[PDB]
């Protein structure tokens, strides 16, 4: 949890729909955004911390 990877994404087209295809019992809580309006705002860099 202290040594987390930080992936840097580049110019591409992200499909935020495969996130809910895995096994059930998973949370999708957002902060400041919404899943239905996620594909409306334009972002420069998205960083994933696992």
- What part of residues 2-31 is at the interface with another protein (CB under 8 A)? 3-7, 20, 28
Please tell me what DSSP assigns to residue 39: T
Whose Cβ is closer to another protein: residue 6's or residue 42's?
A: 6
Q: Who's near 6: CB < 8 A, 6+ residues apart?
A: 47, 48, 49
HSE (CB half, 13 Å, CA atoms) of 31?
A: 0
Whose Cβ is closer to another protein: residue 11's or residue 29's?
A: 29
Is residue 43 a contact point for another protein (CB under 8 A)? Answer: no
Given the rule CB under 8 A, which residues bind another protein? 3-7, 20, 28, 34-37, 50
């Amino acid at each position: 949890v202290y040594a987390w990877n930080r992936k840097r994404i580049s110019n591409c087209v992200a499909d935020y729909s495969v996130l809910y295809n895995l096994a059930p019992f998973f949370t999708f809580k957002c902060y400041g955004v919404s899943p239905t309006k996620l594909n409306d705002l334009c972002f420069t860099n998205v960083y994933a911390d696992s």
